[PDB]
Write a protein that binds this ligand. Structure first.
Ligand code: HEC
Ligand code: HEC
Ligand code: HEC
Ligand code: HEC
Ligand SMILES: [Ca+2]
Ligand SMILES: [Ca+2]
Lengths: 303, 305
């Protein structure tokens, strides 16, 4: 199959094994701690919002809201395979500081309040000494993000029917889905939505905006990340703004004159059918049991 | 006309003003320190090699050699507008920081702590680090060396290429043949990968040119490597081409990029028009004063060989 072979050139399947992070080695106790932090709403100043609120592991790693400039929450699933870390920005700033964990935390908290709160919870410091042995002061923000990152690295979705197809089985997806794939290649979609994550590799001067929703940029210095399409069927709504609710409308907008690509409604349906093959196996995550406040834990602040 | 409006969609001209670096504010003394360090060969263990050796401001910010796995040196000119920092790697690793390009370059020829100890042994350096990073007890550090350099790098931009005058409205700034090259570049789909203010350097793609004058071809990286699609600004003057530097002639690099593997075929006539367009992307080359560097003391480490 030409189509299969062309697919195997542009994409690779998600490995079952969590990828190693260089300079952040995974260990049981570090992965455990990262899981606790991920579900602990005390990392928000109000004590109500955890990472799981906006990146819900039960809803495709996102929260099925438009936004929470406001942005749609991208999935945490397979985010460890994204090269491009942010929805949009100017070239120079995406080039030259804060990564996504820190940025996310600052949405509803201050790093220093976060760390002072963790220190006030007697169960946390012993877990940080186990997870970061050797350090005199292991409860720090950088260590919070390290622990969370080794947990996020286990939030991968191997075994999507498309991945079975990449590994050699032509029958793992329906031939309607195969027609959508063929269309996805020939129309040019794959140039931007490529590699092991089927996107997340780069930025383009191409946002979807209003004035109806259309692809555009005026000569404007902002560029947008072309997202991974993995699990796109269950991470609605779509695009940086979350303004477009249906996958089919998303596919149709992407059939813009501005990126080459003309597509019929019939083409769209086949493409959607193909995009439906990219839903992998969803991680089964245990809700952690969190250590209790002390009398000295800071009070919630409503915002 | 229409070809113009499409080009204004995809590309953006280089600003004349150095871009502001988040958390790395430019100041006259930080810029001056960064220029000194850039031209100081004592940042290498041999004391012979400076940033300017591999990224020569005289030669389009590169060194016109294949390689110095070994990689061709990308230009420093406008590098402040590259989002993608490296030639290639796996997705998960490019996602992480194994250090940025300054640290990694230094590691080609030296160790960071030897660099720092060398700078402290040069009496004229510590005071300049004090002026450049006020309020810090110990300002001579590896991170401060990179910060000083980066604000110096931020001045190494090339505004006013003929193509940028065209972006700004003037259709006569490039030849009508250049304009046909432009039309081709867009229509064959080149611009999706070589877009924005830097006309590339925005992303990684699972295509590298490999050993197959067409011994070289685009081939997929079903191993798990992706390659940066580079900025094509000043491409006419930063030969040889591709991550390995193996293709010397621009026109050959263009033909190679006419790959069916990327849904593209171009005639030889086509290639020539595209080359003509690419030649419009050379900007004004920065005029950089070679610094006068402070002298060793008697305790400055010896060169190694
Ligand atoms: C708890 C501390 C966490 C963790 C570990 C992460 N998040 Fe969020 N997140 C939110 C939004 C709107 C974005 C998009 C920001 C933008 O691009 O402009 C993010 C982004 C991320 C990422 C990047 C994922 C990727 O595509 O590579 C990651 C890894 C990440 N977050 C992890 C929104 C929120 C919230 C809504 C209020 C909350 C709460 C969090 N995030 C918290 C966390
Ligand atoms: C071929 C016609 C396609 C198809 C079927 C899709 N794409 Fe793209 N894509 C690009 C960018 C920069 C974005 C983000 C835009 C924004 O957020 O404002 C997108 C977004 C999508 C989505 C939304 C998915 C989500 O998780 O929100 C979908 C379903 C989608 N694309 C499918 C970039 C590009 C390109 C770069 C030039 C090209 C070509 C395409 N996309 C083409 C297509
Ligand atoms: C002196 C300290 C410097 C500075 C400030 C920089 N360089 Fe180099 N450089 C070299 C090579 C082969 C590469 C490519 C590496 C790869 O991607 O695999 C680099 C890369 C850079 C960059 C990134 C540029 C970009 O495209 O965005 C930058 C900003 C950079 N360098 C700055 C080769 C060498 C050398 C050859 C021996 C020497 C000496 C240096 N570099 C030194 C420095
Ligand atoms: C349309 C026909 C074109 C033209 C005229 C060019 N490109 Fe690309 N390009 C891409 C990548 C990933 C690379 C680096 C590959 C490697 O080094 O192994 C390139 C490289 C080039 C160059 C060399 C520039 C240099 O400084 O060395 C040139 C002149 C060039 N390209 C022109 C990526 C892509 C794409 C991604 C899918 C597409 C499409 C194109 N390029 C198309 C074209
Ligand atoms: Ca979404
Ligand atoms: Ca070169």
């Amino acid at each position: 199959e030409d189509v299969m072979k062309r697919a195997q050139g542009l994409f690779k399947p998600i490995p079952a094994k969590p990828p190693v992070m260089k300079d952040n080695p995974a260990s049981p106790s570090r992965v455990e701690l990262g899981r606790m932090l991920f579900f602990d709403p005390r990392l928000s100043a109000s004590h109500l919002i955890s990472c799981n609120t906006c990146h819900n592991v039960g809803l495709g790693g996102t929260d099925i809201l438009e936004t929470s400039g406001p942005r749609n929450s991208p999935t945490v699933l397979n985010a460890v395979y994204n090269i491009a870390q942010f929805w949009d920005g100017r070239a120079e700033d995406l080039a030259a500081a804060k990564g996504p964990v820190q940025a996310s935390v600052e949405m509803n908290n201050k790093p220093e309040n976060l760390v002072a709160t963790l220190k006030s919870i007697p169960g946390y410091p012993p877990l940080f000494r186990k997870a970061f042995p050797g350090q005199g002061d292991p409860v720090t923000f950088d260590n919070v993000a390290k622990a969370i990152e080794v947990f996020e690295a286990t939030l991968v979705t191997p075994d999507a029917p498309f991945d079975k197809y990449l590994k050699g089985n032509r029958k793992a997806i329906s031939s309607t889905a195969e027609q959508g794939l063929a269309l996805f290649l020939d129309k040019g979609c794959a140039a931007c939505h490529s590699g092991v994550n089927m996107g997340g590799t780069g930025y383009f001067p191409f946002g979807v905006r209003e004035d109806y929703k259309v692809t555009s940029t005026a000569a404007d210095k902002y560029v947008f990340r072309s997202p991974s399409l993995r699990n796109v069927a269950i991470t609605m709504p779509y695009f940086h703004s979350g303004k477009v609710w249906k996958l089919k409308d998303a596919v149709k907008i992407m059939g813009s004159a501005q990126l080459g690509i003309s597509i019929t409604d019939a083409d769209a349906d086949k493409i959607v059918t193909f995009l439906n093959t990219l839903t992998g196996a969803q991680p089964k995550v245990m809700h952690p049991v969190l250590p209790p406040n002390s009398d000295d834990t800071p009070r919630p602040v409503s915002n």
